[PDB]
Amino acid sequence: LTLCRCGESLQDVIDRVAFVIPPVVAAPPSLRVPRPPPLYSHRMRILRQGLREHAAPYFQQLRQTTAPRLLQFPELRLVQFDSGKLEALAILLQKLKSEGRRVLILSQMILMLDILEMFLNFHYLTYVRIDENASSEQRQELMRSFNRDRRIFCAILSTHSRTTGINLVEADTVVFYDNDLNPVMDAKAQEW
Amino acid sequence: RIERIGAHSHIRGLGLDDALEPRQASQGMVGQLAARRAAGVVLEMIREGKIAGRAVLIAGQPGTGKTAIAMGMAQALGPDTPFTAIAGSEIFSLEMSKTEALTQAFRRSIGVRIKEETEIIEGEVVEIQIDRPAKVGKLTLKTTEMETIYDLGTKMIESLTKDKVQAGDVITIDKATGKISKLGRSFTRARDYDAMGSQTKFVQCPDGELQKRKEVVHTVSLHEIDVINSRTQGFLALFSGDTGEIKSEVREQINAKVAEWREEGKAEIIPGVLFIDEVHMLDIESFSFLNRALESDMAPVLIMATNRGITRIRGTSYQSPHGIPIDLLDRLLIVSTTPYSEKDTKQILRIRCEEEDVEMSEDAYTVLTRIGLETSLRYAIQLITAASLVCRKRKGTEVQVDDIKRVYSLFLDESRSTQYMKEYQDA
Amino acid sequence: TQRIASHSHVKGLGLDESGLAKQAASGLVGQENAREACGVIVELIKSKKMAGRAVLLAGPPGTGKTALALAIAQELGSKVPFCPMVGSEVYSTEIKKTEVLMENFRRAIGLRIKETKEVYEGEVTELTPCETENPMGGYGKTISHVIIGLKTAKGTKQLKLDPSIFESLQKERVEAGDVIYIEANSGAVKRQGRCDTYATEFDLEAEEYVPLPKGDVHKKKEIIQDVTLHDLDVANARPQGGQDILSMMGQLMKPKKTEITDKLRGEINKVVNKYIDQGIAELVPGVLFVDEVHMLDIECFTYLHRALESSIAPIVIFASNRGNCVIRGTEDITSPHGIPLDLLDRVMIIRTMLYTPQEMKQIIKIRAQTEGINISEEALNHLGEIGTKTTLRYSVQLLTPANLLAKINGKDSIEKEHVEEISELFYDAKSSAKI
Amino acid sequence: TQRIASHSHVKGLGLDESGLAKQAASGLVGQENAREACGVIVELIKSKKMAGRAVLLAGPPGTGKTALALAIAQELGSKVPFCPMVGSEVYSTEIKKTEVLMENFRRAIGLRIKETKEVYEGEVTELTPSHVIIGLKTAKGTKQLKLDPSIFESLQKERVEAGDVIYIAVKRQGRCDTYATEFDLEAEEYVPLPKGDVHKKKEIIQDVTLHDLDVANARPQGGQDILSMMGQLMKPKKTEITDKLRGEINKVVNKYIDQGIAELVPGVLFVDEVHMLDIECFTYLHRALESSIAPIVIFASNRGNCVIRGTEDITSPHGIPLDLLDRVMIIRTMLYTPQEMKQIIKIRAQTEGINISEEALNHLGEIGTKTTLRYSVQLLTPANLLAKINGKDSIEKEHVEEISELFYDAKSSAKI
Amino acid sequence: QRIASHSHVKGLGLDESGLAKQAASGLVGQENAREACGVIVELIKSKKMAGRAVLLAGPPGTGKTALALAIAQELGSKVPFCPMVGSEVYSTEIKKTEVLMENFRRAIGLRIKETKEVYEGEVTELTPCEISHVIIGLKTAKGTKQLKLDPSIFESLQKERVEAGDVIYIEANSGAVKRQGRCDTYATEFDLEAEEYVPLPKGDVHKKKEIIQDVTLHDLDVANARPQGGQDILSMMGQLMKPKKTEITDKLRGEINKVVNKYIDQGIAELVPGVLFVDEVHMLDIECFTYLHRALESSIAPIVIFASNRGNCVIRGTEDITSPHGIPLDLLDRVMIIRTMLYTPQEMKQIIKIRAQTEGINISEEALNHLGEIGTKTTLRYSVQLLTPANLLAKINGKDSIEKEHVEEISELFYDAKSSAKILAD
Ligand SMILES: Nc1ncnc2c1ncn2[C@@H]1O[C@H](COP(=O)(O)OP(=O)(O)O)[C@@H](O)[C@H]1O
Ligand SMILES: Nc1ncnc2c1ncn2[C@@H]1O[C@H](COP(=O)(O)OP(=O)(O)O)[C@@H](O)[C@H]1O
Ligand SMILES: Nc1ncnc2c1ncn2[C@@H]1O[C@H](COP(=O)(O)OP(=O)(O)O)[C@@H](O)[C@H]1O
Ligand SMILES: Nc1ncnc2c1ncn2[C@@H]1O[C@H](COP(=O)(O)OP(=O)(O)O)[C@@H](O)[C@H]1O
């Protein structure tokens, strides 16, 4: 029969085991290895025969080998929870998608662009990022791919490039995530 | 639905008022206003959970309702809060030390409600056209207010092939992992196949096409340590008691990550209760451990019951009240249960009869209350059952005096057993 | 092989329709009040309304406590389970005492689980009637239905099954002429094997040819399986299916009987209730006869008088033979019947008086009858007299040896001389005490 | 909020610049000589020069020896490990008792090691194979790594579009590449392309204890040979041998130290309830304390002259034999006075979040000096709940009176 | 040689007529116990009786263990002799009765007579034909030939990584192993391969010799207590409990006895019952004595020698029953008791001189007298222990032999049980 393995009402056991895995081994080393400068042929042959015998039943595969955990990466939730700006952005994007309007996210730091990328991936919102690294023609190609493609929801810009290549707008919704208050940057930014 | 009424089934909560004022008879309890008010206030403290490591000792003569008030508190606490009931002799395991069993029992009555944001797409599969090469596929989900077609990927197509999903099936696909979860069907299957007959489930939510922030609160106890001690944990979480895991890197690390989750809003701690019935059976080492284990922040509320006065502590020679060392006994506060009077006994017997669905005359109630005040209460309930059975056999409607008096001679009490025991059967 | 046991004459409490007691009570004689109490408690059990109730069969040795216990057990019938246990069995070196007690309690509880499955079988004649391509799309070649010509011993019946099953058909070697095991709802095909009609004597192969099915193609097989709650506990305890469990060294130690309360209670109880209220199973609480209860440690009684408090605990029939004795595991703590005074308050004591010499004679005679050996009046009187002198169980043991002595001496019936000679060849402990 | 504990009110010894024990500070109150001795002990610990020393905080019940040791731990800091232990913890059914105490001594010691880990991250562009020439692509550039066969992945780990992060000794399939536009609905979830360079070395200053390395080298779980997986397949256990305990471990730790790779961090081991240990534990502690590698141990005994467990024949002071009781310094804590009792009650009420009136505080102090201080401490919360139910924000004398009437102390229950 | 406590005991010291000499073969005095030992040793050599028991009872330091070692030496290594101690029975993974039965089985030995022959051959000549028939070449330092083998041997051979120019041993009945190199691997100048090479073997290509392997029934039991390896059942890892909990007697030990009897009737095996010397018998529990007085009654039990140092006392596990020699009257009876008497001062001095001669220490006349006096004062063992440091100090001081000064100084330096107890009253 099927059991819950815990106090929760109903949930997939796989999800149960995957949710709660805080601890990783403190300091697991490799196995010990005797080092006799001479290695007698008898013992080495016996060990090779044993290894061959143990490798023969490979049809099991040990079900992924159940290898230990040694990384414990941080949860993706923390990207949003770490900043209220990202929670407000999540609420705004959910509202806009319920309304069907695309969104144009404007940020100043490329690291903030990567943060926004991870955030949208946490929210599964398809996006197209246009930054300074991409050449003018590459920026125009990215903008063309964003345009006429209703499957792309968000567009992320750096606000530091010229951005004179953009031609058409999709939903007429912009979100100024960051404010610079710089002499020339903000002016031309808001202008275009 | 088929679960027989036990010895403590008559009680179904701790009768209390808005101001915590105890009542004469309510929720299956009778009399004992002091201990019942103590139970109510300790239950309020439990449901508060602001303080940790509090202990209460329920003392009194046998038959005073210690286990009764314990089960009443357990019931009044209700679900969503763990209540680990255990006997003093259960900590003695041949695969785990006493201290380890006590740690397991303490961490077992502590819960963490883990919040998880989910994004599930649901609807009616109008078209599941899949092009198998032996790669391409499209799913047409339909709702009561909108429709949408989704181009399926190779892995998604394979997953759909795993869990057979025919047209008209109500499914809830998780956009995070793509797990196929079928809930039912919206209509029959062509009315022509001479097989596969079932019932039709209601239509899906109108906005079920894409649920954005479906919040599911996964509740799990701090016994999750079993998930880490070994690569294969189900064996330990289900049957295997040989869980002598390493205390370091497991207890401390799990507690640290639980604190991190509480600080980051992922989960919230809900301390439960640990009820050790007949705690006097614990060895002095177990009491010494409870002395220190009761000081941790994750310590649940430790309710204990003792049916003795001055008695020797197990594992030593010297005696202490309630069989508990002076240290732990002084740490906790004791709730004494006063014996029940004749009226309370009669009312408890009547409540039990109502629970057993048995009826008896007034003279029967009187004589049975007399017998119970003389011998005991539990013996009075045994006589209730025996007389009800004798009446059923006699084809009567209610139990009269002639049935209780008959079963009184048919079944003997320990007081009369020891009287007839003068035949020196053995020693 | 009849293999007559020690005391098999007992067949039931033998109570009259009114519930009173009689002499010829289906093998067991005497013990009127005790047999009436046994009838009351067996009526209770049959009612299946109360749980966690215990009864104590206190009485001096030789009163036939185990006899009346087996009598009430037989009266209950093989329908409800009856798990006999002795206090010594609780002492286990691999599993704690309280968990053994809980496992025994679970065993005492029964559960009948029904299972009805509509399955179709018979020799297959596969054929796909060509149908126009999907009318919603373009043209081409499709299959809207797949007809399978299941032929059974009674006749033939073609089934126009769903076309999606065609994958299963091709998966297994389902060729025209073999027996397939179809499922109504699931639809999965499980080929049983070719028909024996094609099993030519010159073809060397086994497990591949099976006889034709007898009966209609559509068969609604109704099967009932009675398994105690402990069986389900054990089944859900250990794993099955891959996971490198085939190892010998690190896995052959199957005795992991250690069990936790979370799995025992909780999920198992909930699924049992779901099967009950849904109509898939019927709960059948049995009885747990625990003889030599005085042999249990105080750590066992302290858990018993807590498990009996549970609503799921079954009926327990304790049978203590000792008198006032120190509780095991305690420091000179004398209590009646070797049981703590706290547990005796939760058990109904059924007192059993000593058998009257006439009852001794009746028991000896009925045991001789069960054994199948005739005994003369004088021999029976001498047996009764010696059973009155010493323990009664000594006399019943003098029947078979006296019977063999008589048969070897050339006579059939057991004469007084035979029992007299056996009493000198074999004697009891009371006489052996003369060291 | 964080739920209150029994000793969450103590924040430290609260001593002056010269060690003078103030009447009340840092949550503690009274026990000036004891807190000065504890200041000297924490100075010893910070010295990191002596090894194997121990102290016994023997005193009457309720004096706060446990709270005192916890305040000591807090004052020392989180860096230096502080391992709490109960006397009953030594009794185990799978590991030898003296060996339990040994592993406790070991875990009590800390070790801060520095290591540089090379991490390989990026979307897998090529997965052609023993040695596998994998191709990782990132925002910076692409590199074809000549990775070893031991890292060859068994699970899906798609040859293309799979985001993988590897470090030298296991691989983690972070997520699928950002191809969310290729399909409208796919089971796989996506993450952005890693912006960091493929090959990067980061120095992590990880803090671990010596017992971690001990138990890890005891039953390692690394490597890839099938024999390893079969060994660690089931039934982990304990009882590391002494040859592996000492010897290789100490040598490698000293190597890391003298080479600047690691830094030793001596810790503390608080063996509470030492009064109920067997004579074998004491006999092993004799040689444990007499070791140049044993850490500082703080004992907290409560019994007086009683029979030592395991012998049930001979009695000794504090339930500890004289030969051992002399090896450990004695800290004599005195009982609190009614004034100090009321002061600590007020401190706990302030920490516990309970407002108590003057008359209520006086009644609590009286009940404390009469029955027990901890009894009144326990009665604190019930009185607050009673006040809440009655609608009173602050506790009054009547509330504590009713509470005491409901709950009977141990002494009163014994009188009955 | 690392002289031990019982090295000078190289025999029992009986003459041709059977009488015990006053001092011979390292033993001194104790004529009655030596005669009993020389009688029981002949009893053992008879190989006809079974389960007969002996008890070397006597005060401490009387040489009961010395007499046991003398019996063992006189018997010779051809028969098993299991030195056993009572404390050894208290095993944690095997029950005491089972450990005792395993020791009893070890005390029985059998010699397996077998004539094995080899078919060493060259691998370079490997030329199979049909996988159904294979031929291998023979090239040794004394001859060259060729053999014809069953394809099963070819399979077992190719299983090994054979290479041209290797020396392979092929047994006529079963088995095969590889020896790499025959003065050709180092010739090509290719580096090592984690293994050592060997030149071509001398002698004829086909060799035959008589084999006699001394194996005991316990070895057979241990070998049959496992699957023997081979297929996937060969799974073997660390912590394997080779000394398994127990092994049934009727279906496992009985089969071993049956096969041994069969091979003995066939003349292939020869039984040689040994001796089981259980020292410190008083340490065994009463539940051990009760099974011991019954197991030694079986038709297969070997001769068991006992030695109880302490006299009458409470039996182990009883705490109330007291019997002489710490052995219950049940087991005490049926066991031939050999009383050992105390040594006289002259016998003590003679034993000291023999110990000095054996260990190489040289003592003077007055030194020997003083050492014997110190011995008879407290015990002979104290003098035996002081003998070594006496010569050690003598060497340190530049003296070759021991003198009165050195013995007196070393006696004052150290202390004995009597002296220690005398000063322990402080
Ligand atoms: N207040 C009460 N109301 C109803 N039944 C009670 C009460 N107190 C005791 N009993 C009955 O007395 C018997 C034993 O008393 P219990 O409730 O276990 O208290 P204790 O633990 O002191 O024995 C039980 O069968 C229980 O039903
Ligand atoms: N009333 C009876 N009628 C016939 N035989 C009886 C009766 N009572 C006891 N016996 C006999 O007594 C023997 C054992 O009785 P048992 O149930 O073991 O009592 P106890 O367990 O107290 O010794 C049985 O073999 C049975 O034949
Ligand atoms: N010096 C102190 N200052 C403040 N509170 C104290 C002090 N000493 C003890 N306490 C209090 O007394 C209670 C019990 O002290 P504890 O450490 O358990 O004493 P012991 O160590 O003797 O058991 C603690 O909850 C703590 O609040
Ligand atoms: N007959 C003897 N001749 C010479 N040396 C002896 C003789 N008997 C005993 N010894 C010596 O005395 C010592 C006594 O040792 P041991 O036999 O163990 O004494 P016990 O009689 O207590 O077993 C032995 O080391 C042995 O060398």
Side-chain angles (χ1 to χ4, degrees), chain D residues 340-351:
Chain D
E340 303 295 356
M341 287 182 177
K342 185 178 181 180
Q343 188 174 8
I344 185 173
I345 288 286
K346 178 58 176 180
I347 292 169
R348 175 124 279 272
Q350 182 178 359
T351 295

Side-chain angles (χ1 to χ4, degrees), chain A residues 151-166:
Chain A
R151 299 278 65 84
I152 298 166
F153 181 73
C154 286
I156 295 100
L157 306 178
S158 300
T159 70
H160 284 193
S161 60
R162 46 159 155 171
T163 66
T164 194
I166 62 183

Side-chain angles (χ1 to χ4, degrees), chain E residues 45-82:
Chain E
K45 291 178 179 179
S46 183
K47 302 185 185 65
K48 71 184 189 300
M49 303 305 300
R52 292 287 285 264
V54 182
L55 179 61
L56 295 169
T62 57
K64 57 185 71 60
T65 308
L67 268 55
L69 270 294
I71 294 165
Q73 293 293 354
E74 184 178 1
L75 289 169
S77 180
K78 60 180 182 299
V79 300
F81 181 86
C82 299

Side-chain angles (χ1 to χ4, degrees), chain B residues 7-8 10-11 28-30 61-68 307 340 348 352 377-378 381, chain C residues 346:
Chain B
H8 300 288
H10 64 298
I11 55 174
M29 290 186 176
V30 174
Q61 307 300 346
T64 53
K66 301 187 293 299
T67 307
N307 192 82
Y340 300 96
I348 293 169
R352 170 56 62 179
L377 180 60
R378 50 181 106 251
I381 298 173
Chain C
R346 289 175 174 85

Side-chain angles (χ1 to χ4, degrees), chain E residues 5-6 8-9 26-30 34 59-67 309 343 351 354-355 380-381:
Chain E
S5 180
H6 296 154
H8 63 74
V9 183
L27 300 177
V28 179
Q30 205 72 233
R34 287 170 62 178
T62 57
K64 57 185 71 60
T65 308
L67 268 55
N309 183 91
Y343 295 100
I351 293 169
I354 293 173
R355 166 58 65 177
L380 179 63
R381 180 57 53 180

Side-chain angles (χ1 to χ4, degrees), chain A residues 38-42 44-45 48-50 52-54 57 59, chain E residues 159-161 177-180 194-196 231-232 234-235 237:
Chain A
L39 297 84
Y40 280 97
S41 61
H42 190 274
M44 301 303 299
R45 292 164 183 174
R48 288 195 299 273
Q49 292 172 213
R52 295 164 185 176
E53 181 276 348
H54 284 289
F59 55 88
Chain E
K159 181 175 178 59
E160 295 292 354
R161 300 295 181 275
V177 66
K178 159 174 174 177
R179 288 78 174 82
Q180 186 178 10
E195 302 181 0
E196 61 180 0
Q231 301 182 356
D232 190 10
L234 177 55
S235 179
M237 308 299 295

